[PDB]
Amino acid sequence: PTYGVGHQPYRVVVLSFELLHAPATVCGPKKSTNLVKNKCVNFNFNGLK
Amino acid sequence: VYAWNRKRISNCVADYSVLYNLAPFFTFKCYGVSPTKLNDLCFTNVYADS
Amino acid sequence: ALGKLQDVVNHNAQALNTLVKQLSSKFGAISSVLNDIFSRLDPPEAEVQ
């Protein structure tokens, strides 16, 4: 701590991702609902908005 | 750093609020995605490095 | 014997079908689907792409 800031230790964490190009597992706080058949709607489908 | 650690996160629900809103995380800059679009998306093949 | 008329028809079919294939080119963007661009980026960069 006698060293100035810029020399203090900084904890670093990096996160890697693949975007939609595989079956998504980890998801956010969204709540599901039943689909519809043969009706014009808008969907999310794991991110395919 | 020379012998850093990697973690495989699988089969969880993502809630970035508890971590976005925490005090010590004064730096949050992302590259391929907007910082505030995390909760609007699902993820697969999620890994972290410490 | 009548390859000229077939030439006209085929030229139109090719010309229009290339158009359908054109959408699979990112053009230097993140991807070729607008919805993903809007659903993963903040307005400033999203708009740019």
Full DSSP string of B9-34 = E-S-B---HHHHSSTT------SSS-
- Return d(Cα B29, Cα B50) in angstroms, integer: 16
Tell if the CB–CB gap between A27 and B42 is shorter than 8 Å: yes
Resolution, expressed in angstroms to one decimal: 3.4
| Cβ proximity of A25 and B10 under 8 Å | yes
The upper half-sphere exposure of residue B22, i.e. CA atoms within 13 Å in the direction of its Cβ, equals 9
- Give the number of beta-carbon pairs within 8 Å between B and C: 18
Most C CBs within 10 A among A18, A44, A48, hence the mutation to make, goes to A48
**Chain B residues lying within 8 Å of C33, measured CB to CB:** none
The experimental method is: cryo-EM
- Return d(Cα C8, Cα A31) in angstroms, integer: 53
Sign of the C-alpha dihedral computed for residues C44, A49, A13 and B14 taken in this order: positive
Most C CBs within 10 A among B16, B28, B33, B38, hence the mutation to make, goes to B33
Residue A20 buriedness (CB in 10 A; 0-12 / 13-18 / 19+):
buried
Quickly tell me which residue has 């030229």 as its tokens. Answer: C11
